[PDB]
Amino acid sequence: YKLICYYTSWSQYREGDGSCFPDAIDPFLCTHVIYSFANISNNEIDTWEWNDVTLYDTLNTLKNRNPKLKTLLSVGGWNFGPERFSKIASKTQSRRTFIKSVPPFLRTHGFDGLDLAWLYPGRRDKRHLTALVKEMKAEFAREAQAGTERLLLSAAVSAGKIAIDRGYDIAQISRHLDFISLLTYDFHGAWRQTVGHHSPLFRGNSDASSRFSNADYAVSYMLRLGAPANKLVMGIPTFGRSFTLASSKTDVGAPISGPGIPGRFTKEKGILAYYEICDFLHGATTHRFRDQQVPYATKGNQWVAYDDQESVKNKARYLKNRQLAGAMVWALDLDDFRGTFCGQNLTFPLTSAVKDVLARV
């Protein structure tokens, strides 16, 4: 089984204990660690943060401890305009320029592959997406003739039915990609004003619509569109999504006024790190959707949909029973990496729980 884990560059700026450097990553926890995110300038892959080359170096030295660890560099992300991707992939000339620039960059900094994070391709992008993947892999096969291990190519894919039908030729890109990460944790659209869980495993016997917004559906669909199970990696969140309540109603369908107040270390409305949730739980009322099998909490006018060790173990069992390639975690720096916030003196509570289940066979 594969345990693919993301590390974000900007987590270095969080104050105090929230500050996280590649340094904190346990080299034996994951099988693959992906660094997010790289930029594109003059149609070439390029660094993002001023100290990326120092951090690249730090992350890749972990391979001196665990020789079997693979690292990848991810391009794109949310703060990268999807149009910018759209523009590079559409003109076969800027596409070739970008593709060509990747292997040397990866080789200079020591990465073992490239992760594509185009969020998200639209209807007019589908065909170009396929071409970008096809050609990038062809370039990787050709570069391995130099006598070095082929670089890996992976992609982070939307888990929404509409998004998938709209911009991805799954049967096509699955043949060229080494693995596909399913973003199965973005299921409650910031668009509506009701309370809901962003990463339910199952449909939830109490609701006739949006039966497409749960991990189980997303996986069954991908397997149907033609994605081989041994290439599919299911995403597991290490963060929670918060909401400020509009009334004293706390159960399903309860109304919302907007996102929850920011976390002290994460400082971003609507999001909380797991270690921040561990603190938030004190004095909070914990509940759990039984059909969906995911927990949520409430304190004052704050409502939080998250994942704990047992829902995370649950998801990992699910993934094994359906025989997928492994699990993907977003993101290491949101888990209790210091291990000093969530009670039990365990480092990376959530990611470890996932690894334990995966090691059982």
Ligand SMILES: CC(=O)N[C@@H]1[C@@H](O)[C@H](O[C@@H]2O[C@H](CO)[C@@H](O[C@@H]3O[C@H](CO)[C@@H](O)[C@H](O)[C@H]3NC(C)=O)[C@H](O)[C@H]2NC(C)=O)[C@@H](CO)O[C@H]1O
């Ligand atoms: C749940 C989750 O991971 N959400 C992701 C977003 O957090 C993320 O946006 C990032 O936001 C943070 C802050 O909102 C940005 O960090 C800032 O980075 C700048 C420039 O490097 C630095 O000077 C600031 O100190 C730092 N601000 C903070 C809050 O301390 C970060 O740059 C954003 N990401 C990027 C690459 O721009 C986006 C990332 O696209 O992904 C969400 O999934």
Ligand SMILES: *[C@@H]1O[C@H](CO)[C@@H](O[C@H]2O[C@H](CO)[C@@H](O[C@@H]3O[C@H](CO)[C@@H](O)[C@H](O)[C@@H]3O)[C@H](O)[C@H]2NC(C)=O)[C@H](O)[C@H]1NC(C)=O
């Ligand atoms: C990721 O790469 C982007 C694409 O190369 C890069 O885009 C930006 O590049 C420059 C620098 O900020 C911006 O500014 C312009 O630069 C010329 C200076 O030669 C000025 O004459 C002009 O007035 C303008 O200020 C562009 O606006 C901008 N291009 C974009 C967004 O398409 C990004 O800076 C880079 N992102 C990061 C964080 O590195």
